[PDB]
Fold this protein.
Amino acid sequence: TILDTSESVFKNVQGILESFGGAINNLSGEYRITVEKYSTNPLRINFLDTYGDLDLSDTTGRNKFNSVQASLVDPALSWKTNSITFYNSKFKEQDKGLDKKLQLS
Amino acid sequence: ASFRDFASNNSTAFRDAVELALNENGTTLKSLGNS
Amino acid sequence: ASFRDFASNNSTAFRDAVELALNENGTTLKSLGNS
Amino acid sequence: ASFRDFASNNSTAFRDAVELALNENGTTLKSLGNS
Amino acid sequence: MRLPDPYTNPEYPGLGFESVNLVDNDPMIRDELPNGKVKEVKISAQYWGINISYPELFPDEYAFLDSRLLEYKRTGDYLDVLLPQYEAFRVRGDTKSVTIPAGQKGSQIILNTNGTLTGQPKAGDLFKLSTHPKVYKITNFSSSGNVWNISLYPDLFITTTGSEKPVFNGILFRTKLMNGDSFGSTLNNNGTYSGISLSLRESL
Amino acid sequence: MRLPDPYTNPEYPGLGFESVNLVDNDPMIRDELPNGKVKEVKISAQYWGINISYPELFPDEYAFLDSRLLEYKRTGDYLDVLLPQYEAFRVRGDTKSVTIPAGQKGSQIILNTNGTLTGQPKAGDLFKLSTHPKVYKITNFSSSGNVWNISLYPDLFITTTGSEKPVFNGILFRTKLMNGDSFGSTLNNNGTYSGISLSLRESL
Amino acid sequence: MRLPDPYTNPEYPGLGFESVNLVDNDPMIRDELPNGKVKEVKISAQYWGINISYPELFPDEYAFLDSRLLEYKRTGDYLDVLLPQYEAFRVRGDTKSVTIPAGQKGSQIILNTNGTLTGQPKAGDLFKLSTHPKVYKITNFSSSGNVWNISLYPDLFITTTGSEKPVFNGILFRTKLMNGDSFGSTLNNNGTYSGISLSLRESL
Amino acid sequence: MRLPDPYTNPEYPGLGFESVNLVDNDPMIRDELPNGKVKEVKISAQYWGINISYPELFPDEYAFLDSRLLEYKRTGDYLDVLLPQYEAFRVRGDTKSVTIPAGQKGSQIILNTNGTLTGQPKAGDLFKLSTHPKVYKITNFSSSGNVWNISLYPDLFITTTGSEKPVFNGILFRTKLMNGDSFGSTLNNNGTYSGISLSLRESL
Amino acid sequence: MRLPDPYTNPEYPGLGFESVNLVDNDPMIRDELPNGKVKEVKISAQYWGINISYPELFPDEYAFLDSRLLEYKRTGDYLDVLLPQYEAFRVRGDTKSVTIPAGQKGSQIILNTNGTLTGQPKAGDLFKLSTHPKVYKITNFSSSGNVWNISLYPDLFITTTGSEKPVFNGILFRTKLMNGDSFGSTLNNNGTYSGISLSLRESL
Amino acid sequence: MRLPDPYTNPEYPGLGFESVNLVDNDPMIRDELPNGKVKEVKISAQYWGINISYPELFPDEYAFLDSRLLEYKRTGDYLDVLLPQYEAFRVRGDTKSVTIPAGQKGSQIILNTNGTLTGQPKAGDLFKLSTHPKVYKITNFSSSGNVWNISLYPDLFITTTGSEKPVFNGILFRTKLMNGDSFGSTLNNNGTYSGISLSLRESL
Amino acid sequence: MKKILDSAKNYLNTHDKLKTACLIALELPSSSGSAATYIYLTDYFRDVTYNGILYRSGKVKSISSHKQNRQLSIGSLSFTITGTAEDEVLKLVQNGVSFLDRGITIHQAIINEEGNILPVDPDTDGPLLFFRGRITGGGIKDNVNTSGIGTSVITWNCSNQFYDFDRVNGRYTDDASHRGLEVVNGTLQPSNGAKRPEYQEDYGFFHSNKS
Amino acid sequence: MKKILDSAKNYLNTHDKLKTACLIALELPSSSGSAATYIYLTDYFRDVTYNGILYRSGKVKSISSHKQNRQLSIGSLSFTITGTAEDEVLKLVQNGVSFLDRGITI
């Protein structure tokens, strides 16, 4: 990484994160760094343990994509930009063949 | 309904209430004068 | 509370009430299409 | 009136209600981090 | 300062409490989960609320009562209220030779009477420490020799320092007069004052 | 703990319910379809609600009652009550030798008295399992010799583990007070506490 | 399931309907234009609302009624309500040899009685099909030979398949008990239960 | 259609208005100027409102009444009513040979009886044109021989086309029900439907 | 136009004012500063509000009153209201030879009676100018020879042009009928009309 | 100005308070601390509030009263009132030769009569300084020969300048009307104005 | 101006009480794109047959208002199902199912005296169209009250083709994007991601990276 | 997952009426950076001793809700003092005093 120190501290931290997941948390006193992961022993919540309210919301539009196109500064080239593009046949077999591309950098 | 008139009589409060949730992150509404 | 649902049913009024306090100065919300 | 305090206690709902009328067209409030 | 009652001032019989209302005010945050379990949370303090009602008052009775209330509002003192129904004398003797071990911050007083007190307090009576103005009600009492085990409804508002002395008789509520912002009394054409009510709150 | 009543404390006949309101509280996701059909889904647990009203209480009886209630508020446990209209001892015998086969959920229940109980529990009477504190209400009864088939209005909260024993007499509701936050008592010039009432609510 | 009434259960005379309230619930969107023309729009269905009031109930009457209501709430069945004022027997005979032509989806039933039915239905009576639980009121009736022209208030909730059979007598409302979320009854010190009301709604 | 009443159905004397409220409903843009002057602009159309209250209705009379009302609700037409206090037959004769010259707008109207009518319509009586269903109210009358000059409170909704005939008797209000959405009837133990009332409202 | 009263129309004794209510409506912006000084601001005008109540009305009395009210609502005129209690004749003579100097815009009229008027007006009477319809009450009156110093409650709504003539007797309130948007009267089964009220406002 | 009353105008005995309500209005920043202590800060000025109720007023008495009130509303000055229950002339003499030493703030006040006054002002009586129009209330009195020590409920609004003279008799409250905006008077058929009442409020 | 049959112009002018029903036809969210199942629903109290299709009742509760300005914008509509059907709940909350591009057509039907559909649209001689678009969103709102009546509402979100305003559909000059390359087992093989099946053997943009 | 002692996991599961107190410790706004004075406060009705520190009562009135998303943002909290203490008022409204970087632990 290169951190342009002329940027703000808040924006620099926000840019260091979102590159590996990450979420700075100030709860319970300390600063805790948490990244996305899968566990074989998660905490079991039944709906009867809740307060009775429940809101389900799935925004498949504007958030579900079938293919990704990314770019990066690759030292294989003379530190120029290289594009990584690939599709998924299963995700396009689903969604009735709609063409939706995820753009990343 | 008749809520439009009311909101039009309390616009500055709406602006402040909006800018108070954007300051949670680093966003703020004073960045529109550039554009 | 249950205010979220209501506001989600009157969004355009909120937008107008916001844009009415930004026009006090030279700011306006139609300057977001550029970005 | 005493509406300012209330709105200051429900700011996120105001932000969402605003961003819900700007998404009608292609505008959104997440385009302020650039500026 | 003592609120005028027909104990100290029997010449004004209209100053008696036509009806008292000892209100238990203990605000709590009560939440009922869908699984049928009701859960409570207590943070704030408990304060005894006293409401006094009065009959028609003659000019002299009202003059005395109003002079006392205005003296209260002038010096900013604390009205003391005496409830006759709580003045049953059970424990008699000296409360200076009794010792209370220190460090007691729960909802229970353990005291060694040292055999200097006759009788035993009854459950539901009024109990108070000598160094704090808060008034307690005895919910249970077990005596094993000279050491007494008095249980109190409000959790001990102070941590015993070892110098406190229990007070069983002559207990007064260090109240502060509420509803004094708009306090008035209408004088009828027959010369008697009507519509006088004292909403008092225990301001320890 | 036990709520005082003339059965536990016969010396205080003023205690005892002047009127008891046993309400049924089953929350439900009711939906009124446009075609006329009404669809309701039961998710939240059901709980009996008990509203007790007391007659004119003399000062000593009220002292005992509020002492017990303040002990309740202090130690924070549950407050058991015994409704007397459901105290018709219609089933004699000792229920220890009565087995309830394990693995039973729902309204229906099967228990084998093994030729021990005498008396038939008619519909409308109360029923309670030995372990769980929930109180049910028998809606229909049918017996084939020693085996008894009982249908209960609330579904069995816990599945029988083969050791739960029936309790056809002396059923106590594990309740919690709902008037605690602001509970006042008025004293008349006649010398009695008037309008004492409780809004209880079964917990779990 | 039938609601207990003094037809099936005359031994409990307190179970009679002290006053019934047949409520016509047909929600409509009514808009009044400034030109004086009032305009209505109907989308939702019409459901008959029945409200039952009861007098003071003795322990046995209340026990029976409560057992029936708890059985209802247990099995999730449908309470059937019989109104005596609508039990005038005019049409008598067999309703199996009568034929109803199919495809009738309006607000009018044309049926060929085939001369098997004696008498004629009167306007304002209660009419119901054998394959649907919705209850209809006859608003008009014209007979031209054996074919009858019965006009009904609620628009036909089903399209006739040709197998439906008209029902004129013995009509019950397939109701579902509303206000059952908080259902209770206070027991007075004299032994009688008071404050019992059934707000029923026709859940077809 | 016609609302049943003792004139149309004398066999049902229970029908008939116990009390009728004929309200005047003229919406207006009223403005209270700061100088004391009150300015009101009439834009929305005026409409008479009729509130009918019925006496104790026996079951058969109510059956007829609600049958007619449900036929109204079914076929969706208008519901005509005849107020009996305005049924004083003060004008004899046949009005077919009475001509109203065309091109007349506003409160004033001129009609030529051609020496046919007998009787003078005094102020306060009703008036209605043959074609339009609006009902007016005569406020002043003045006749010069055969020609009659009548002033009506509501301005003529439609300009006379030279063929409209006066209707001085048997005037029916073309109304619409306003209690239809929730219309319930209670049956007493005495055997009568009590408190039946209608809130009608003239349409157009 | 004059409202019917038992002066002009004594044949209808039911048209008398059972109770009048002269309401002083002078809207002001009143602000109370924390320093105990209450401050007022007056911008809008003062208008006399008159409320009339009526007893049960026979058909002829109601017919006359309703005809007059409908004539008012038809021509859009101004109802004139006469209060008998303000009809004491003190000042008598000619009001045409009296001169009022021009330029008087305050709250005080200085007029030279020129010795043409006998008697003197009393404080609290009703006074009105001949060129404006607003009604004034005399709050004070000092006479120094022929020039009178009449003080009026409402600030002069007009600036005197020198041609105005004082009016002391026969003063009418140029009112406009409020609550006419929904104006009605219920006719009871005994033939008398009830529930008639006139809320009038001085529309100068 | 002076509010009319039987002392100023004995010819009108209808004037005079049927009932007077002298309310105490001290705004305060009261705060209820979580520990049970109640903290209140006095910032806003205190002001006596006077609610006057009149008996049945005959037309001439009401004419005088509302003439005076309308003169008040016109000239805009303050309206003085004299409460008669505090008119017990308990202090004889002329108070001009009574000196109040300068530089005194707070409730306490010291004044030297120089052997002029006869009579002791008991607690509950009124007191007012010559210059400032505020009205206080004596709460306690103590005299050592000629010097008098008086404690007043409201703190001295202005510090004594050495020239203010005591006023123990004829104390008038400088009040302002609070019912002016909508003040109506009803005239009965009996001939009296009923329910006339005033909500006064001391200004400054 | 959407033209209306003159026959409907008489019914809409003479009759005051209009019985209107909205016929909804949404495509089932399915895990794969195979087949096309439709659920037909109506807001009317009885089922309505249109073109031989039985629009069953008892599920739909409310429909939102369709608004269109003169500025390009997504046309959002919201219709709610009862949420206690327990057969519509599982379709929405099913795992591994996507409804990214499932359509929905809503008709506005007027019922006659005899119970039939009054013809309005001239081209079809049937009812008008209220809305036709795509399903973009959804949700269910459970509210269990510990004392009283709870409610559950399933709301489906709808919009037109421009729902994703941040969408860049273009043929970027690259072999990997032009042929829709994807690793299948151990090689980058062309797939169906290409805009045309004939793009799978097009090597035109092979040397575009070094050009 | 902030781990909790198993002993507390029994109390939080068996007892229903929980008596909770929030112990506030804020640094005094001082004109200079010299020294570090602390005011210790509590929301409980009686003073609570923790690590030998007496958290005095009678001042704190309410505390806000601490919310944390998965997007970087300032974590705002708001606790209110009575405002009639007249000893906390002067500390806030004092002239020439700055509290730019004064901490608080709750």
Q: What stands out?
A: The interface with chain D takes residues 69, 71-74, 76, 165-166 of chain K (CB under 8 Å). The first helix of chain K runs from residue 6 to 14. DSSP finds three helices and twelve strands in chain K. The helical segments of chain K are 6-14, 88-93, 175-178.
